[PDB]
């Protein structure tokens, strides 16, 4: 057995401009086994209309998945990705950092 | 296209 904890990145598809439609992404990679819970949150509430890529894996057999949702950023809306995996003592919530 | 040969149980 091997267990690898997920690396998680939260970002937009195109540079973010308030008032302009875009896509919010939560990319989870480097994990094993494949069972993983991923939810995108808007002001702390789960977003239902989220799509995800077909499970695939890297050269070291670790898995990666992209979860994404269409959204229009605003100044007040806070977004985050919630991930749970067997390697985490508790779910990890990663906020979308718009200032990098 | 997928392999049609060489895929056998371990």
């Amino acid at each position: 057995m091997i267990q690898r904890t997920p690396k998680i990145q939260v970002y937009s598809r195109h540079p973010a401009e308030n008032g302009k439609s875009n896509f919010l992404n939560c990319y989870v990679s480097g994990f094993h086994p494949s069972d993983i819970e991923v939810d995108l949150l808007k002001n702390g509430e789960r977003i239902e209309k989220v799509e995800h890529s077909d499970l695939s894996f890297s050269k070291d057999w670790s898995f990666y998945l992209l979860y994404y949702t269409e959204f229009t950023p605003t100044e007040k809306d806070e977004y985050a990705c919630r991930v749970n995996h067997v390697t985490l003592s508790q779910p990890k919530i990663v906020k979308w950092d718009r200032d990098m | 296209e997928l392999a049609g040969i060489g895929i056998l149980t371990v």
Partner: protein, 273 residues
Amino acid sequence: GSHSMRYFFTSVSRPGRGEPRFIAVGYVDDTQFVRFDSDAASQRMEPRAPWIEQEGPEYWDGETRKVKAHSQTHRVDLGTLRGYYNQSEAGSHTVQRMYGCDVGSDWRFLRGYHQYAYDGKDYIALKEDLRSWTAADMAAQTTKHKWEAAHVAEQLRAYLEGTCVEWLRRYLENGKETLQRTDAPKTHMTHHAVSDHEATLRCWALSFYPAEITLTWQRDGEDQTTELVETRPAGDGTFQKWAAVVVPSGQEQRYTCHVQHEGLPKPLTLRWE
């Protein structure tokens, strides 16, 4: 440049929850073009790229028949492996298989591969000569002997050096517009203070394709070790990546970020200015 075609298969047992999950995906370079998911509605191989949609019903019927056969083999494998390792029926286990071929700039066969993993670790793989196997441990030696007796390698070799390459060329031609393209990265830098004495310089590469790229930070012409994130998909067929370094405020000019990508005439040098 060079090109590759790869098929990735993942099978996961679901103790007390019935049949194992089976997911198969096909890629040409960094572009996915087909998928099959045991939990999806169609129960068929499905297209995921516009250029593969033109293939006819014979192609889809054939691919669906073969992916189901792959599924069936992996279903048996899960039970066999649990047996080889005398593992309980309580836990979920994972089998992963990857195979495919690479061709050079002239689109001629370069290398082939067929690798198999159990629970995230190498289990057995075909060697680069495509005529012998590397078994990870004692249990895998049993499969190695079985596959040698059955001449599995010569069969995979025929596929990897022939069929695999022939179809990769066909796909490259049919999807020329999107597969034989390079999108140079759009680059920039950001600068943010970490404290009154330090600042983070982040070098960004966006909207590039293919995924392969190298971002390096140099201080007065010498490589630095810096934070790098894994290259990530934008969701529109391109990729993104950034690299950052923490520098003493006032010394920003001692740093340069270098970007290399096949879509770039020559490597780029960025500086905070």
